[PDB]
Amino acid sequence: LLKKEYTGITYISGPLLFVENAKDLAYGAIVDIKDGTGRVRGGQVIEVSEEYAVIQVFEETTGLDLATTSVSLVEDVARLGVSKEMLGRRFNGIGKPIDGLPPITPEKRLPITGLPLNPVARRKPEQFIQTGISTIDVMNTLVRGQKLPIFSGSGLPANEIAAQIARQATVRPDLSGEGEKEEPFAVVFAAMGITQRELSYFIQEFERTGALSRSVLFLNKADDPTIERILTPRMALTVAEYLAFEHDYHVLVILTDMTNYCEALREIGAAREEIPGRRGYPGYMYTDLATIYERAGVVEGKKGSVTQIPILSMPDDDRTHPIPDLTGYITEGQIQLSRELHRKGIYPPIDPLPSLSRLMNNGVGKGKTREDHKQVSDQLYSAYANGVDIRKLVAIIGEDALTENDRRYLQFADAFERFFINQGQQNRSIEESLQIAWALLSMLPQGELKRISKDHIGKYYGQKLEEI
Amino acid sequence: IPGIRAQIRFIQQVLEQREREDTFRLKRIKGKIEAREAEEE
């Protein structure tokens, strides 16, 4: 293929430059900008007309001039280039390897934006994922094909929870009872706006337990060019969906911090002078986030699946901030961390009252898990809410008015927060979590467990304290 | 106190949004007057 060079640069200011005689440049094409010193920059065509084409420069425009600079076409659509050997490798935000190993050989080249899934082609998510955390596995169960974000704050340990979930994720095919072979499982881990300290932490965490052997890492640092932060989730999702829908993998995708992505999007949009939104964020932010989140799911007639767990920090713990608010309108629930539990030293500090999983009711039950999962989850929620109400009542009018049942709920709440939630670094199984849940359910009278049916009581109402 | 603080920050956000809208309008009108005085030639 030949190479075309456009030299009619007529205007440069900020991140934009105009090429006048470039009618052949398609809309959205990727271009290479070369200056007099031979350095090459990247760019994208954001608007093309008969008079000129407008190109947004990926890096800074320092060193460019109207005399020696030239523009060349790379490709019409941004392609990644993927292979099944990417497992165990480590890449930056733009896809280049950063682990020192040689680059891969592409089996195929795929557009990074993707295409929407036909709703007729989808199917309902049906199977659960064992994250190894009781508060998630029992009360907010994750389902293969779901979008389930985690809402955190400033000092809360989101990174540790993400690393633990990445290490401990399994599918548990035995509980399905079908006896099928264990399906391949992989983790795609995309990091945006990460500092060197967190980068080293993640690298060491992945290399400590050998989880890197089944993982693909996309790492974008805070000092990298801004455009690379935008493309990182799209690279990760392209790799994930390629693996899932061409090799029958069950892929789990983790996005470390969507707040940095939103800040990068705001900066890039404001560079082009779009109409501002609620807090300066672009008005099309909902669509932009949807084009990322909507790519997860399961397809009829295929074995693979894509699951997404976005992680984001709520600014000032304000749940009404545009980022968490727009994220909630797209996903199928949320896992919310609590500062009170963090002060109490509980880890992971997941607050079950404001958390919810919308697809949970279809992913658990007989054949999917143990047959008492739904009822014990409901009973746990009811009892914990009652205990929290007792706590709120005590802190105003005094403890002396408490009935025996009220103080029983009061102590059950403390036992719950101390044993069920505060698991530390343990990789609890689903059966272990159910056993613990029943153990502290037996702390209440048998007739008080109103949500649970009589048949599961007695079979599991062992009247035994925890063995841990 | 927390309710008053939430009200205060809500009002501050509304005022900042209105100021941003006014700035956008000012930039628009300046761009258009420049465009008029230029393209009139």
Place this chain on the structure above:
Amino acid sequence: TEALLARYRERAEAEAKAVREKAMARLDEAVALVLKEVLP
């Protein structure tokens, strides 16, 4: 129990040698294919 890695190191070296000796005998055909695909 600390001497495990030596056998895997030598096996990796043997595997690399096998791969490169497999590659050496066929480099010319690949080069001819590249020259045929690039040249007009």
Place this chain on the structure above:
Amino acid sequence: ESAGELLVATARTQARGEVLEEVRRRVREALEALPQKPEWPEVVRKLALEALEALPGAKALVANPEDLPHLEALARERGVELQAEPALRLGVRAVGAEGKTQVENSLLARLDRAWDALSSKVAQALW
């Protein structure tokens, strides 16, 4: 204890990378050795005729001093002006009618543009 498999995989990957680097060196030598072969005068003619037709209108044609003797004839046949450049090597370059657009057809650029596409094919055929 499973790090041995990691070492084996890394060794295999590095060996494959070295093999591809050797193939690249061989291809580079074969391409740079072209000026000594009889197909070379026809190759430069093909590149010139492709370059002069990629641009809808060519103001002038820039050619390497050693390449213009083999293409002066169709330089006059196409009706475009001929210009020399000692810096241009392994191909010819054309200039658009308005002077803004120029197209390059050197073999080195073609190799750079096509190797990332044919690497998978050469790996599949070789192994």
Place this chain on the structure above:
Amino acid sequence: MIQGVIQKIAGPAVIAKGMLGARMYDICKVGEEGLVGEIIRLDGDTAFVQVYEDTSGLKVGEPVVSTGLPLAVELGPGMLNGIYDGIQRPLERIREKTGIYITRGVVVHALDREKKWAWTPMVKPGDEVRGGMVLGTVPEFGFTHKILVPPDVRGRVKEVKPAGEYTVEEPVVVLEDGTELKMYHTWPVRRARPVQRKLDPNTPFLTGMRILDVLFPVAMGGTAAIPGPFGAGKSVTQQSLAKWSNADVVVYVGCGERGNEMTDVLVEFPELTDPKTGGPLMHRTVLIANTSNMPVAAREASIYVGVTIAEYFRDQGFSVALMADSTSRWAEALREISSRLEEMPAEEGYPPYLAARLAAFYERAGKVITLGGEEGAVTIVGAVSPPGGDMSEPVTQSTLRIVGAFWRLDASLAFRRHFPAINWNGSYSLFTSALDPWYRENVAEDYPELRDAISELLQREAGLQEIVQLVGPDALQDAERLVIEVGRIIREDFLQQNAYHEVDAYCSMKKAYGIMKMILAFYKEAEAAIKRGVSIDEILQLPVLERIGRARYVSEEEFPAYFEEAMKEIQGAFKALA
């Protein structure tokens, strides 16, 4: 036809030149792939076209052609049991032609041209016809689909096809002027279909949910808005309405929402049964799906296509319920298009004409006398998604000025898993007064007084709860403590409703009436007992409270006897206490 070339490309907007003679709001085909677009501005010899598809990869100079016609839908047999995209393309055909991914540039007819229908004429040669008159009938999944004359056609019948099987393209009736009438016709989505007259709504729209059907009713042909933050339950409520309402035909518009919610309907509805008639529920429903990652400009087209199909099914003589999943996404598309035009925004970036668009959309609902001389109705329920739950947002305020009912959802109730989670203090309804005669005739003579008593009890509980929160329950007398307990019973045993339970998902009007009567009877007896010096703590321990709380889980068949038994137990319990 007018034919030009692309001059400029910028996002979902394309400027074509050489289009002198093109008309406003006509449909144009942009580029080599023929992407569908619409003209929204004319200037010089140029036209401004908004593209309903992805514009990536287009080049300046590609041809642009104008079809000369506005955006329109095909109305005829074959719409029920189907699912369509933003511009009415069958998604199943698109799947079978292009795989699991939705690619642009696919052309396929809205109505299947190969299926044959049992045509039965009703008009005779020589008859004078007019717009909206019935020419014949066609079986449609157990419905009697009526072939209607287009609204602006007049003439005398010259020839009628006999009974038999024909495709939708068959000219079944020919007029004396040469006009051929087929089984289908086209209609511009931006023009409201004419009617003879609009009537006053006097019959209820039974949603099957106790709180909405009782406290804030909506009448047939009315309009309701359901705003709420994320996770409040708009989609679950709308699906419950689509599954249990007494409408003849349900039209669901997925304007910019998730794709899993659209897949859930396709998977589940073919297995459920229509409450009004045997056969699967999916034979009753038409889906218009344009998900979040599908092209933005197609949301407005989705809304207009849905409302036009609802109008057509109304014109056939049915009662149609129209649900719009989110109008905020449509407002977002309007804002984006206005931003591409460089117009002056009004507030929060929305174009100044948003309120006019919303009013024009909502005004298509109503109970009417059709052009054919029979009754029909369209009921519109539109959900809103205010940013951060702010009710001062422009879309919500503009919607509240034209709708007759306001079903406000509360995040505080949703975060405690109290569903359906309507804030009964912020909600209202304007149809409650006009529906009283129907309630008296069909439910019970004294039903409105019972509903008023329930509302008064809820108000008293609300007015006592802040005192409870301030001084504590221990300092309160027996009367207000009984009021608080009765309010709690009402909130947790009457207002609460599980949309996933087999029995509790649906509730008849008589069941709600029975529950309310039981609650009021218990309240009266408990008040009398308190006046007789009985301790309220003793009242709370009575075993009949469990019977009252368990009432909503009793099946419809078994409820009438359960109600009598519960009333006898309620009177006996305080009778025995003395």
